[PDB]
Amino acid sequence: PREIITLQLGQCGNQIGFEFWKQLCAEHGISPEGIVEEFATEGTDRKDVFFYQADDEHYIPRAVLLDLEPRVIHSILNSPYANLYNPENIYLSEHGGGAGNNWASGFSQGEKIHEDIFDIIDREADGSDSLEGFVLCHSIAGGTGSGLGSYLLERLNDRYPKKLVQTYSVFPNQDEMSHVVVQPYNSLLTLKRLTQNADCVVVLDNTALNRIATDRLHIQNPSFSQINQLVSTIMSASTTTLRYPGYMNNDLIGLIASLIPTPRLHFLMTGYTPLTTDQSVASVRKTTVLDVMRRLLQPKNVMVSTGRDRQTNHCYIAILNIIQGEVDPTQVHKSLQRIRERKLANFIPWGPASIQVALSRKSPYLPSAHRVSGLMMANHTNISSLFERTCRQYDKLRKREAFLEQFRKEDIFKDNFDELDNSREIVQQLIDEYHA
Amino acid sequence: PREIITLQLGQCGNQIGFEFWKQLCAEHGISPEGIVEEFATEGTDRKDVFFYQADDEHYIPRAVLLDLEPRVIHSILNSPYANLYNPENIYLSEHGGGAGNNWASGFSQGEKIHEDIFDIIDREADGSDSLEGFVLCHSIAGGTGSGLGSYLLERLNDRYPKKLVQTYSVFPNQDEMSHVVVQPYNSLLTLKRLTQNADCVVVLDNTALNRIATDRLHIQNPSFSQINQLVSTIMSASTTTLRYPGYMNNDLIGLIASLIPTPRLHFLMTGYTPLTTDQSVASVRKTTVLDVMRRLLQPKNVMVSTGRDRQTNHCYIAILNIIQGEVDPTQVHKSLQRIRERKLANFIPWGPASIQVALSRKSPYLPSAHRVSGLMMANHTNISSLFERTCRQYDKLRKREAFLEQFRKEDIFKDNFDELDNSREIVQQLIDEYHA
Amino acid sequence: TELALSGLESFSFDYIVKWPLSLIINRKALTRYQMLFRHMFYCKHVERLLCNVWISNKTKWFAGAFTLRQRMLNFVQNIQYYMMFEVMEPTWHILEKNLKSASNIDDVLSHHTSFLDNCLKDCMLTNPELLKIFSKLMSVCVMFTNCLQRFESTINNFDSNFSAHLMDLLDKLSMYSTSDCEHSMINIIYRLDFNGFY
Amino acid sequence: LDVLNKNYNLLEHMQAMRRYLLLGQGDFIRHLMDLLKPELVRPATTLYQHNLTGILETAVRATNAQFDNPEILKRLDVRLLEVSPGDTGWDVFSLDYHVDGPIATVFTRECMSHYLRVFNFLWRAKRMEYILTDIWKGHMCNAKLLKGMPELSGVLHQCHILASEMVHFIHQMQYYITFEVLECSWDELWNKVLKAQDLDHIIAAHDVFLDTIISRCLLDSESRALLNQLRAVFDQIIEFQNAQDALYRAALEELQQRLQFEERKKERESETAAEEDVENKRIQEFQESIPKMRSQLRILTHFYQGIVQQFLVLLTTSTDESLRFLSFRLDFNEHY
């Protein structure tokens, strides 16, 4: 019916998808090894849209996880949520990889394991006779997720041409350049494949993570154990129309169709306010829907590093405001009434704009059926500031003679560096041209 | 909506803003790590005007704290109110700074950390699509708060031109000149930026603090632990129309608009009477509002060192008298009846004057819903006596050959000393000219 | 009553109420409420735009242009606190007598409707020519926004225009001093003799 | 109210009919309408009935594992018209809620006869949502396969913008007019039936319910200005669709012969003037078919500009009912 195959790949893409499947059992009322609660069918009306359909009421995840590093998968099998995963769909015990840290490693390893990489991931494709598409849950940081992920964006474009492609990709961190220095090279090589060899992306910045991780979360030493908490909730938040029973844009080709203006303009800004557990003691007094979307357009919950004074000459075109759970829908048109009076979104002068609001009932659970949740999927034309940030860090590195002799020994014979530079400037010029 | 970003900066500006946020939880009925009381929404009708809006009913403070000295921030994390602060909005653990004691240190450090200082403080700007403005909660004493604070008064004037700027700045102490000697230099350099690169200030004298700290408080050895008690109450007192539900001048651009006569005349005199805890046993007999504003215009609660015999040729133009909590509003027009009979405020002979009184209900708390509170925001033209005090201590120091060779080695090539002297005399001449 | 609005908008609020609560808050009483909401929103509508213009200007002929605005703003901040306060003290007095007396329902109905007639007469204060000076006050708001879009002869045209409503303010103050010594006029004298000692 | 709850659950059938004829739940009707489309593209025949009951029973099984327990699938059937077999076939299919005994006490002949009228507009609303889903996937299908030609790169680019103007304007209008009438009527009837205590007040709340909603959905004697513009956008949305794959197909097949002729260039060296003449013929057919798609686009956007202007004025004239609510909504969509 609407079966999606997630493509978890890389050192960071496997960990953000590990707790994504772990989030799904707590809201479906199911255990990874059994069914102890009856809340799975009376409370939740649809479960076989991301999981594989049941053979013994065991909803297998439709997931594949490949990585060169064996460290990310050795921290999985000792956890009690790995018995839900199957040891025959992806790998058996003692799976390995390369050495290995290179973008050209996984780019060259795709055609030497070409027979095996297109054998076991295609067995899940013909399980349903109407496949939705493929989401590449991969990474941009490092050479593991960026090297091999650029290969599958090409060969799955023609072997599966009538399928939706759209990824929840995480952006790397640009604070210092000591541990990694190959960061401007492997990022722009995948970013070219994300626009012409891929339809849509969902950007997730790393410098904007610790802006939120010290905002309300109150940590002193930033660890990697907090990167899975902001990411796994908004992943399950994006499929609330798709997993839980909704009516309009209840498919993944429903939501993405109403937000993309044009190809190579698909970078969607994400926002999510409620992350604090001591808000729970004051949501008993009928906290309404009239105050939760006034702060979405206000740049506080954003996960995109952008300029603060560059929003006057930029214009919103498509903005999504997803409320979940208890909505009190007699005032949801009242919340959309107050949008035109502030004009917090700058509107495009050539065409109409749209503020789309939708709702779906959440899990039968006490932290879910009590507190209001707001998921934002914006589309603003100030996203070229990240593309100006990455390009200015790209041409400055090529004048310092950095990784021009250390990178072209394997499988690179011609200069494909300006092939990425002009196509990035094509994106940056067509964005500003789009508001005439 | 009406979100203000506080800019806590310097050795003294960070400590006066630390208990300012600590004062706000005791009156909102909230804990810095949880919500244990239900008094936050039924008693207080508005909370998201200085805090960040909630994600889990955890009202994050919209605060940034930068200082060269790491001593002020190491006395924060062991206190149990630091978990409300976030370790990703400003800094993570082990943040440092300079060596360091110079006005030219922070003035030169602003353009070498120019990329990072305009990156994470702008993430809170786009959280709300209608930003109120910026308050620079900085210091004039020392070279830490005065050196770096003069840089942000220039670059935020054009990058954010449509925002209100107004600061609660503390004046340094002029008793002896042994420990610090650079006090006339770094003060006048920031005082030029406070008039043309800044709209309004709120003056807070240091020699007038120990006038009050030995008046009713009865201390023998003056410590720095008392400087946060007079300052944090009047900060929360100034936003009682803004935090608590009021009607008129309920914004920060409401109060400051009705008091400023002209640019470069914005120095507001502050007054606050009730600071004694043994007054509580006799406020049970209906202590009225008719006696609390007779002592505001009487020079007893003032925090400005001014001349006592210089008030006959000077005239009040704008005077604010803020009552809080229990007001008994059937006699608040009766209190304003008695103002014209005494004429304790000298009125300007060229134009009208105004005695503005306003009220707002206080916190649902027993020391707050019982005792009358009076906050004064005066504007009197005897404020040039401080400007005559600072200028006479400025030209006397330049004839003693003090810090003319020890100050111009770094980033100073021309004599900008008379650039501060004439602009200060422009303020002092236009004040006396303003009453024709 | 038989008067019209003082702007362009036909906007107002109406409260929906049914039996037996319609016996005490009447549909005729909603029309008495509908007149006071139009007056109080319009001077609040003025206070918003004027305050925004002042903040924009904040962010000599320009010192005199700030001098007319601060004089006119402090005039309109004081008068509208007076309207807010001297509505509010009949509000606490009308609250207390429903607590002091209440033993009949047609009494507390007629107690409430006689209160709205006091509020209606306080907003029928702008009947003969005051609604013309509030619109002449509004035409020099929009004439000052026509030069907000332009950034001096324009400033002395404003000094001529801001002295024009000053002489009409004393005309409205002269109209405030004329009746047979009734209480609402005595109310409007001490509030405007408050405006006299300034 | 004991008799209502002990057997033949009447209040539950009031909610169960909203998921099918009012289309309150989408995962049912979308897993229908995916499978239902390969039968509706052809004209209806005399064998049209026997397979759609099997298309029905497979699709209510693929979405349910617990809906076998109530008696709802036996009280819902399919409804076809007497229309001649020379039609498109899309307008024949409709679902109806069947009644047999005491459920037919609260449901008369006059109730489901109006439910056929509320279904046909809402089926056509979901018809426009799913055939335009096909052309949106058709935007992303042909564009990935034609990369290699520098002319046709910017040719599809402005076509995708002017198609997106019709996509976003249909979306913020069609999603909002049905969800609002869903909102005012679900919260009017379902909360009232358990606070009134009768049989005749259950139906008195019901027989005012089911004619409030259709008068806000489609049908009124004064609503002739409504459907005349909602059908003028309903045939323009077909005219915009069939002209696209009349020109996308001409854009894609002509590029397939270009790539296989490139493969013949390397094999002739391992195993020429006329070969250049056939390439110049390809470029000329590439040249002709670009203003062929342009000129049809200039005719299409002039029709859509005439539709969007006529949709405003012809919605603002009827006789003083809740049309001030309807005239509030369409100017909010085009400007914001």
Residue numbers in the entry:
A (entry chain m), B (entry chain l): 2 to 437
C (entry chain Z): 605 to 663, 673 to 764, 821 to 867
D (entry chain d): 545 to 815, 821 to 885
Question: What's the publication's text?
Answer:
The cryo-EM reconstruction of the native MT-capping γ-TuRC purified from X. laevis egg extract was at sufficient resolution for spoke-wise rigid-body docking of atomic models and thus to discern conformational rearrangements at the subunit level. Spokes 1 to 10 of the MT-capping γ-TuRC assume a conformation reminiscent of the isolated γ-TuRC. In contrast, the last four spokes display an increasing deviation, witnessed by a pronounced lateral movement of the γ-tubulin molecules around and towards the helical axis, approaching—but not reaching—MT-compatible geometry. The separation between γ-tubulin molecules in spokes 1 and 14, measured in the plane normal to the helical axis, is reduced from 4.7 nm to 2.5 nm when comparing the isolated γ-TuRC with the MT-capping γ-TuRC. Consistent with incomplete conformational closure of the γ-TuRC, spokes 11 to 14 continue to display deviations from MT-compatible geometry of up to 1.4 nm in distance to the helical axis. Thus, the γ-TuRC partially closes at the MT minus end, but it retains pronounced conformational asymmetry, deviating from MT geometry. Notably, the actin-containing lumenal bridge of the γ-TuRC is partially destabilised. While the two MZT1 modules part of the lumenal bridge are well resolved, EM density for the actin molecule is significantly underrepresented as compared to the X. laevis γ-TuRC in the open conformation. This suggests that in the partially closed conformation, actin may dissociate or have increased conformational plasticity. Similarly, further expansion of refinement to include the attached MT revealed the same protofilament organisation with both compounds. We thus combined both datasets and obtained a cryo-EM density of the MT-capping γ-TuRC at an improved resolution of 17 Å, which was used for further analysis.
The γ-tubulin ring complex (γ-TuRC) is a structural template for de novo microtubule assembly from α/β-tubulin units. The isolated vertebrate γ-TuRC assumes an asymmetric, open structure deviating from microtubule geometry, suggesting that γ-TuRC closure may underlie regulation of microtubule nucleation. Here, we isolate native γ-TuRC-capped microtubules from Xenopus laevis egg extract nucleated through the RanGTP-induced pathway for spindle assembly and determine their cryo-EM structure. In eukaryotes, the γ-tubulin ring complex (γ-TuRC) functions as the major MT nucleator, which is essential for cell viability.
